[PDB]
Design a protein around this motif. Structure first.
Motif, PDB file in Angstrom:
ATOM      1  N   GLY B  43     -46.111 -12.130 -13.620  1.00 40.08           N
ATOM      2  CA  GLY B  43     -46.240 -10.712 -13.320  1.00 40.08           C
ATOM      3  C   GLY B  43     -45.288 -10.275 -12.224  1.00 40.08           C
ATOM      4  O   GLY B  43     -44.638  -9.231 -12.325  1.00 40.08           O
ATOM      5  N   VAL B  44     -45.196 -11.068 -11.163  1.00 39.27           N
ATOM      6  CA  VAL B  44     -44.195 -10.898 -10.120  1.00 39.27           C
ATOM      7  C   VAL B  44     -43.438 -12.212  -9.983  1.00 39.27           C
ATOM      8  O   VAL B  44     -44.045 -13.287  -9.932  1.00 39.27           O
ATOM      9  N   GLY B  45     -42.113 -12.126  -9.938  1.00 40.06           N
ATOM     10  CA  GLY B  45     -41.285 -13.315  -9.994  1.00 40.06           C
ATOM     11  C   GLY B  45     -41.275 -14.139  -8.724  1.00 40.06           C
ATOM     12  O   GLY B  45     -40.251 -14.217  -8.037  1.00 40.06           O
ATOM     13  N   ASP B  46     -42.406 -14.759  -8.397  1.00 40.65           N
ATOM     14  CA  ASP B  46     -42.501 -15.630  -7.236  1.00 40.65           C
ATOM     15  C   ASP B  46     -43.415 -16.804  -7.554  1.00 40.65           C
ATOM     16  O   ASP B  46     -44.247 -16.738  -8.462  1.00 40.65           O
ATOM     17  N   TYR B  47     -43.247 -17.883  -6.796  1.00 39.20           N
ATOM     18  CA  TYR B  47     -44.067 -19.074  -6.953  1.00 39.20           C
ATOM     19  C   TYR B  47     -45.225 -19.043  -5.965  1.00 39.20           C
ATOM     20  O   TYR B  47     -45.048 -18.705  -4.792  1.00 39.20           O
ATOM     21  N   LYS B  48     -46.412 -19.395  -6.450  1.00 38.82           N
ATOM     22  CA  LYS B  48     -47.615 -19.343  -5.632  1.00 38.82           C
ATOM     23  C   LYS B  48     -48.659 -20.269  -6.238  1.00 38.82           C
ATOM     24  O   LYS B  48     -48.474 -20.824  -7.322  1.00 38.82           O
ATOM     25  N   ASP B  49     -49.764 -20.430  -5.514  1.00 38.11           N
ATOM     26  CA  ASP B  49     -50.867 -21.251  -5.995  1.00 38.11           C
ATOM     27  C   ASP B  49     -51.638 -20.482  -7.061  1.00 38.11           C
ATOM     28  O   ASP B  49     -52.276 -19.468  -6.765  1.00 38.11           O
ATOM     29  N   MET B  50     -51.577 -20.967  -8.304  1.00 38.84           N
ATOM     30  CA  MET B  50     -52.181 -20.242  -9.416  1.00 38.84           C
ATOM     31  C   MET B  50     -53.696 -20.160  -9.276  1.00 38.84           C
ATOM     32  O   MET B  50     -54.294 -19.119  -9.569  1.00 38.84           O
ATOM     33  N   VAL B  51     -54.334 -21.247  -8.841  1.00 43.29           N
ATOM     34  CA  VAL B  51     -55.785 -21.245  -8.683  1.00 43.29           C
ATOM     35  C   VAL B  51     -56.202 -20.253  -7.603  1.00 43.29           C
ATOM     36  O   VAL B  51     -57.163 -19.493  -7.772  1.00 43.29           O
ATOM     37  N   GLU B  52     -55.486 -20.246  -6.477  1.00 41.00           N
ATOM     38  CA  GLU B  52     -55.790 -19.292  -5.415  1.00 41.00           C
ATOM     39  C   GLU B  52     -55.485 -17.864  -5.847  1.00 41.00           C
ATOM     40  O   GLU B  52     -56.217 -16.933  -5.495  1.00 41.00           O
ATOM     41  N   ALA B  53     -54.407 -17.670  -6.609  1.00 43.16           N
ATOM     42  CA  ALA B  53     -54.025 -16.337  -7.059  1.00 43.16           C
ATOM     43  C   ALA B  53     -54.907 -15.814  -8.184  1.00 43.16           C
ATOM     44  O   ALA B  53     -54.794 -14.635  -8.535  1.00 43.16           O
ATOM     45  N   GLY B  54     -55.771 -16.648  -8.752  1.00 41.09           N
ATOM     46  CA  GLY B  54     -56.634 -16.228  -9.834  1.00 41.09           C
ATOM     47  C   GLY B  54     -56.031 -16.312 -11.216  1.00 41.09           C
ATOM     48  O   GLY B  54     -56.681 -15.895 -12.182  1.00 41.09           O
ATOM     49  N   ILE B  55     -54.813 -16.834 -11.348  1.00 48.27           N
ATOM     50  CA  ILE B  55     -54.176 -17.004 -12.655  1.00 48.27           C
ATOM     51  C   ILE B  55     -54.614 -18.373 -13.164  1.00 48.27           C
ATOM     52  O   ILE B  55     -53.937 -19.384 -12.970  1.00 48.27           O
ATOM     53  N   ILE B  56     -55.770 -18.405 -13.825  1.00 48.23           N
ATOM     54  CA  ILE B  56     -56.365 -19.645 -14.301  1.00 48.23           C
ATOM     55  C   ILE B  56     -56.746 -19.487 -15.766  1.00 48.23           C
ATOM     56  O   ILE B  56     -56.965 -18.380 -16.262  1.00 48.23           O
ATOM     57  N   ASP B  57     -56.826 -20.621 -16.453  1.00 47.92           N
ATOM     58  CA  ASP B  57     -57.202 -20.684 -17.854  1.00 47.92           C
ATOM     59  C   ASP B  57     -58.346 -21.667 -18.028  1.00 47.92           C
ATOM     60  O   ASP B  57     -58.471 -22.622 -17.255  1.00 47.92           O
TER      61      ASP B  57
END
Ligand code: ANP
Ligand code: ANP
Ligand code: ANP
Ligand code: MG
Ligand code: MG
Ligand code: MG
Lengths: 527, 88, 527, 527
Positions: B43-57
């Motif tokens: 969604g935004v072109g940056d690297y981050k913690d997916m679990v912390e950011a809520g991008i989980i499956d």
């Protein structure tokens, strides 16, 4: 009949032609680059990693795409002629400049100002490259340069380093195909030519078919010797001297030859007769250079001296001479020292004069004859197909090593262009379009390192970012070793390229690509 | 399978407008430098913690997708004949 | 078999052919114009901004459209032959006249009267151009003209301005390709030719391979010298004189050459021998011009003087002579001043006589040899592709600068034609159709400035309206600077072009376009 | 126009071309291999089991598949040139290396490192082959090698074994087509040439048209003999000697011939006249070698000795000479023993010198003339079609037998390569890709034994596994006898191959296949 295309359509055809030619060449870049097999009409195909060899064979059906391919072919051809190495890098740079220039022009920039900006950027880049250059200190840099240019072949690098050491600074190195599978180095010293052995009886070493004369005189004369009466007086003086005599003439014919061999067979004298080297005008050029370092006189036709009028005074003095079926060589002579450097200087100034008329490398051959030795590297392989590839690598390393002696060395692996491009950030111009041309060169200068990493199985941009930050953290010479895949000091690791090769490649690439970018229309015949 | 498992992340990066192989290399590096949960946000072109950011499956979705894809691909790899009616 | 088309169909084919040729050429007009790449069958393509070069390659499949293209090609060809510059402007003018003439004819006007009206308008325009002309004052105008003609290249303009200053008014400037990437200017003064260095022993300066003679005599003679007895009497006299002697003959052969070099080697005399320049009739033409400024006699065959009969009196006197492998030059001589002015007047009067038979520029070369110096500008570039474009620009600026010296300068950027067209409003004729022809020229004269603005990214009509009103508000010389995009005084800003170029372009364009407008039928073979 | 293909598509075309060429050749491998009929434009087709003969005729329509075929053709051509046998084995090895290399590259391995790993593996294999070699002891190994190379023909092996025994170590064996259906061996000893029988009256044995001279003198002279007065003195002193005299001259013409035959007919002297052999430069080469072993003098032109000045001292001595229409041979002479050793020694050293200029096998012919004898095996068959096949087999066995003498023998049937490949398990390298190249050679080395078993109706892998385990259970020399289909000791059974043939085949195959594996792009003309 002609057809003319304009604007975007014209540039699209040019880009397709440039890209197709560059794509074939660029697969050979880097230590892990691969080879290209070129179809030959008659005979076996040619396998080569040489960039200019691949580019010379490229031609396309579309007339407009062929025009783009032919223009970029001149980048590799000129780089090969001037430097002898870096043709693949020059082609990669040319494609990068043209591709970036098309994007800038598509935004509405003036093509002429882009070319002017490109010219200014290259001048800064070349100046930065010269500042980054390091002079060659000795055999270590010579061996390292030869090894890298030979696609990381230590065997080739060792041989070439030995060859340069033997022939000195003024020597000439020649590469020839060997008759066996082994690669050997042959070095000869002195003034030697491709004549000798007029008669089989002129033998002093029957174990080797070699005629060696100890402290011999030489007779330099430009015409045939056939009269017995004119031939007699010279040995009449020579037999009084008692030292051996050697004949250098157009030909020793019939009766004059008969009396020479018979008198030698009787053992009263020690003599030999050889033909003089050269054909046509090479007669005057070679015999004069033979006479200058022997301490004698050429006895040319202009001097107007007959055979009977000669004496021991004008006959030159030599230490040793060896005569065989093809080779005659002299070890030393009585020629004055200050004369040979005068001839050496005379040839060097004559280089600019000879370049307008020459078609043979004899200009350099004459220089090395009286100034040192000439080395012949005989490249050998089990099969001719491998021999052609190996010989090409040796020739590439020989040319690159010579360039390193001239203008020094620079960090290899494309690091030098990356470091040079860093100086373009401080360069500013009043014209916005000329600023775009500067940005084009900055992006292009960093293209070759990305292509090398790509050929090695690494991401080009990831490597480029690390190399850029390593310049500040570690130093200028730090770069990426694509051979094994880590970052290290390129100069200390021995991954170095000549400054001349890098300078020539960037200058040639910008000259063609900048000229191409100013095009608006293409005129070609309708097929 | 190793190449296939790393394909969907490249496709997501390519769709958003980024170079897939560059994103994949950065994600692999961030696994050791930061942690396993670190990845690339599209969604935004940056690297981050997916679990912390809520991008989980859901882990069921990932498990079933790889098993089902390998199952159909395996059968098609060893398929030796296709039988179909002649049209019209 | 032939096919004939009439009326509107005939003019439609002609217009299509003219437009297609003009469209390709017109993209190179102006300082921001772009280049055209021309396909070559063998070798690299040619990139050029030269208008006549592009037009010469244009050909079309349709026979009737080709006729239109071929006719307009003569406009650029004639302009290049006469002026050497302004070919693109002439092509633009020719298209404008033809297009406007077609519109007038389509309204029912008589084509013959339109041509007559066009001829009257051009005479007024040419007269107005001459009134607007300004003579060249010095180096400032010369440098400005050269810079503009070289596509705003200050480096080229400076070199050409220096070249004209060195060779003077009667000098000749030659452009050649350099062997290196640098551009250099070489100037020689005096009568020099391409012979010399018969024998290697004729050396007085071993540091430069140059034979320099101080106050030498010269020997002008037209045949071979081989007989010993005939050669001795001239040396028997000069050895009495003691000064050096130089031989100019068809050849110094064998025994005659032998005694000359041996005598020189012994040091008693100082001498040299060279071949006479030229071939065939050129020997007579050149030796007489060599002898005229040296104060001696040619000793030709017609004079009936044998070699033994010569003396010191008929031998000419010279100050210095330098002999090398190719070049022999003389600094000065004893020739009478009034003789050479007669010769240059004779040659200038012979120009009309020589123009009917000549095929070489030797007519001007002989003029500059005895009246000044000849400069050679060696254009150099990194790559041959850029070299060809750079050399073309230098040649264009050389021709334009020469034309500026002849007929003065005039404001550039198309302002001169705009100012000249303003005088056409007061011109009136009794014939309505001839009045239409005058209006055609007025519109055509203002076309080039609009095209220059269009190539620069500006609206042509907006620029033209402002330039027209600036003529009254500010002055005649005020125009539009398409290089940076503002209005200023063209003469003060240095944007100037020769009056001859402007005059020739309009005259040639109207001559062809006016002739084409009178056509009604076209006859061509069926393909 | 050119088209370039990359990556998998490029390798797919190469693999198809290599496979198609290898498939045709491989059907002839082994004792139970079959023959290939090759179409000839004019005349009968050619039936051959020779591997290089089949490969030389292979060409394909697809340009890229042809490139693969042409490259592998150099494997058989080079093997035939160097060894003369094992061309089919070399082709089989080349296909195996290329096929395995493609699989390794398809997994992502670096082609350059694979080539380096292949080079290291071959060096180990060649060293292991040399360790496994056994020197040739005598006729038993010679006959066994010839029989195997002749496709298990005992008749051919017996003849070649006899031929080598007669000619000794320095002899030369020649194969020619017989005029009848029988195969015969002809051996001649001494210095013999293809001249003789100037006149029919020179007959001493009317039962054979053979002129035999007992203890004759020979006259070596290089020009024509036609003057009577110069011709008399040589008989004036030999008639005093009384021994027969033989003339070797360029020609005995007219009067000189007339007096020689007439004097012989009267019975006072015994004489004959023959022409000297050779043409051009071969005169000096041959007469000198004729004179050296006869104890006389060549009486060459350089010696400056007239016909009347000759004497018996300079005339050589011989025991017997035989003269017929074509053949003239000498049995022995008075030449000193150490002289012919030096001449033999001079020639072998001259082999390296003449190899750069020769086009005929006269190098070995001259050596064999004075060092032993030459053998001619006349191959005969009922029909020419069978004759061509039989002659090819004999030539193959002759070349193989010569190679066995040089570098010894080795177990046959592909066992030697299997044993050599066993040493590759202990070879380790730091690079994973170079390790893959080693594994490629190990699989390739075991390919030929599998192909031989396949051609014999057996499973290749079943045979290979048994042969591998028999190396430990029984010994190194144990292998599979494909002739009858059981396992036995190959060396004891007589199934042996020369070490040179095996070494050359593996080296040539790896040199080409390794080079092709580094390719990435193919450039060829569009048909
Ligand atoms: N081990 C290495 N690691 C990184 N870069 C290397 C290494 N070896 C060589 N290079 C670089 O790779 C380039 C040389 O590769 P090469 O394929 O010879 O290019 P080229 O010289 O442009 N082509 P050619 O004219 O065919 O020799 C240079 O920029 C070298 O500095
Ligand atoms: N900076 C400038 N601003 C405006 N007009 C200019 C400028 N520089 C040159 N010109 C004008 O542009 C024209 C020259 O452009 P050019 O492309 O050489 O035309 P040409 O002379 O007709 N063609 P060629 O024969 O190829 O030189 C002249 O009319 C110049 O006066
Ligand atoms: N009776 C046999 N049993 C097993 N192997 C055999 C036998 N006879 C010969 N061979 C092997 O078969 C090979 C010879 O077959 P051949 O067809 O001559 O192959 P090549 O020498 O590669 N081809 P060419 O150049 O045409 O002679 C060698 O490896 C021999 O050792
Ligand atoms: Mg290189
Ligand atoms: Mg111009
Ligand atoms: Mg065989």
């Amino acid at each position: 009949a002609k057809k003319v295309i304009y604007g975007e359509d014209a540039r699209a055809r040019l880009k397709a032609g440039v890209d197709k030619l560059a794509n074939a060449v660029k697969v050979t870049l880097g230590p892990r680059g691969r080879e290209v097999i070129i179809e030959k009409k008659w005979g076996t195909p040619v396998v080569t990693k040489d960039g200019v060899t691949v580019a010379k064979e490229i031609e396309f059906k579309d007339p407009y795409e062929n025009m783009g391919a032919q223009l970029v072919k001149e980048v590799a051809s000129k780089t090969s002629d001037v430097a002898g190495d870096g043709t693949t890098t020059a082609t990669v740079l040319a494609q990068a400049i043209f591709n970036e220039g098309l994007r800038a022009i598509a935004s509405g920039a003036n093509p002429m100002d882009i070319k002017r900006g490109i010219d200014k950027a290259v001048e800064t880049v070349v100046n930065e490259i010269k500042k980054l250059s390091i002079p060659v200190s000795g055999r270590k840099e010579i061996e390292q340069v030869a090894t890298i240019s030979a696609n990381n072949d230590a065997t080739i690098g060792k041989i070439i380093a030995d060859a340069m050491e033997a022939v000195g600074k003024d020597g000439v190195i020649t590469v020839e195909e060997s008759k066996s599978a082994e690669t050997t180095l042959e070095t000869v010293q002195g003034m030697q030519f491709d004549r000798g052995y007029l008669s089989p009886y002129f033998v002093t070493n029957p174990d080797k078919m070699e005629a060696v004369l100890e402290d011999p005189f030489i007779l330099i004369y430009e015409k045939k010797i056939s009269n017995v009466k004119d031939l007699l007086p010279v040995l009449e003086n020579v037999v009084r001297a008692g030292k051996p005599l050697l004949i250098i003439a157009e030909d020793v014919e019939a009766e004059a030859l008969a009396t020479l061999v018979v008198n030698h067979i009787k053992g009263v004298i020690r003599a030999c007769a050889v033909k003089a080297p050269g054909f046509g005008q090479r007669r005057k050029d070679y015999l004069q250079d033979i006479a200058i370092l022997t301490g004698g006189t050429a006895i040319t036709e202009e001097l107007g001296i007959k055979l009977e009028s000669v004496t021991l005074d004008m006959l030159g003095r030599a230490d040793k001479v060896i005569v065989d079926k093809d080779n005659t060589t002299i070890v030393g002579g009585k020629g004055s020292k200050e004369a040979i450097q005068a001839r050496i200087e005379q040839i060097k100034r004559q280089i600019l004069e000879t370049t307008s008329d020459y078609d043979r490398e004899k200009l350099q051959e004459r220089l090395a004859k009286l100034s040192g030795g000439v080395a012949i590297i005989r490249v050998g392989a089990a099969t001719e197909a491998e021999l052609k590839e190996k010989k090409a690598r040796v020739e590439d390393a020989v040319h690159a090593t010579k360039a390193a002696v001239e203008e020094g060395i620079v960090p290899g692996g494309g690091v030098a262009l990356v470091r040079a491009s860093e100086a373009l950030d401080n360069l500013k111009v009043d014209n916005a379009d000329q600023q775009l041309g500067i940005d084009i060169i900055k992006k292009a200068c960093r293209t070759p390192i990305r292509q090398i990493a790509a050929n090695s199985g690494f991401e080009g941009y990831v490597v480029l970012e690390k190399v850029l930050q390593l310049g500040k953290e570690k130093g200028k010479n730090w770069g990426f070793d694509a051979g094994v895949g880590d970052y290290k000091d390129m100069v200390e690791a021995g991954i170095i390229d000549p400054t001349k090769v890098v300078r020539v490649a960037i200058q040639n690439a910008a000259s063609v690509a900048g000229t191409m970018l100013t095009a608006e229309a293409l005129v070609a015949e309708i097929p | 399978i190793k190449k296939a498992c790393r394909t969907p992340i490249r496709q997501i990066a390519a769709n958003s407008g980024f170079e897939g192989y560059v994103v994949l290399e950065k994600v692999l590096q961030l696994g050791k430098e930061k942690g396993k949960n670190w990845g690339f946000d599209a969604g935004v072109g940056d690297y981050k913690d997916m679990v912390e950011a809520g991008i989980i499956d859901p882990t069921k979705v990932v498990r079933v997708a790889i098993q089902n894809a390998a199952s159909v691909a395996g059968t098609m790899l060893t398929a030796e004949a296709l039988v179909a009616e002649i049209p019209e």
